[PDB]
Amino acid sequence: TKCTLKSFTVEKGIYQTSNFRVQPTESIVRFPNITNLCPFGEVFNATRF
Amino acid sequence: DIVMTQSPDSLAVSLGERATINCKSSQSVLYRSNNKNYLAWYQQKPGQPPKLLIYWASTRESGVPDRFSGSGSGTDFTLTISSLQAEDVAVYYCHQYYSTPFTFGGGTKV
Numbered sequence: 001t002k003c004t005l006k007s008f009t010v011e012k013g014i015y016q017t018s019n020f021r022v023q024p025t026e027s028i029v030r031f032p033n034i035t036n037l038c039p040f041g042e043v044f045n046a047t048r049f
Numbered sequence: 050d051i052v053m054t055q056s057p058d059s060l061a062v063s064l065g066e067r068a069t070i071n072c073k074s075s076q077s078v079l080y081r082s083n084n085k086n087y088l089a090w091y092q093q094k095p096g097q098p099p100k101l102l103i104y105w106a107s108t109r110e111s112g113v114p115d116r117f118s119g120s121g122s123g124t125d126f127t128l129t130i131s132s133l134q135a136e137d138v139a140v141y142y143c144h145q146y147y148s149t150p151f152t153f154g155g156g157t158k159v
């Protein structure tokens with residue numbers, strides 16, 4: 001509060017100082033179960049362009 | 050790669066007639082920037098390295114009479130021999146050159 005009002009003494013009242021936010025406890029990833037690699041070999045590396 | 054099915058394999062046909070050998074690879078071995086079908090027809094008499102018959106699977110090269118004729122497109126190709134002669138008891142092959150690795154035919158012992 002002292003830093004919000006920029007004073008070393010504060011007067012009786014209610015002051016809004018900051019914001020509360022719950023924090024993420026975990027990180028999850030969901031991707032499809034596709035498995036086969038991709039045919040980049042026969043696109044970049046091919047005889048006849 | 051490009052695995053080729055060449056039919057038939059055991060041509061036993063009398064002299065003078067026509068005959069035809071078709072080829073069917075898994076891939077459509079063709080090109081459109083140059084409408085040239087990268088594929089060739091070869092033949093071989095026993096005892097010698099084979100001899101080139103048709104390039105671009107259609108066009109005739111010098112020293113080739115009408116006893117050979119190349120045609121085809123897509124992934125189906127035909128070598129047509131109009132008349133037979135006594136020197137043509139030989140093994141015929143198809144061969145791709147569209148993309149490595151190169152492959153040959155199964156053979157055709159006419």
Ligand SMILES: *[C@@H]1O[C@H](CO)[C@@H](O[C@@H]2O[C@H](CO)[C@@H](O)[C@H](O)[C@H]2NC(C)=O)[C@H](O)[C@H]1NC(C)=O
Binds near residue numbers: 040
């Ligand atoms: C065709 O193109 C690929 C790139 O998509 C190249 O990958 C090579 O793989 C071999 C084996 O590890 C290594 O020489 C290098 O990882 C790559 N070669 C390089 C960077 O020159 C390669 O040119 C071709 N792929 C294969 C299996 O030959």
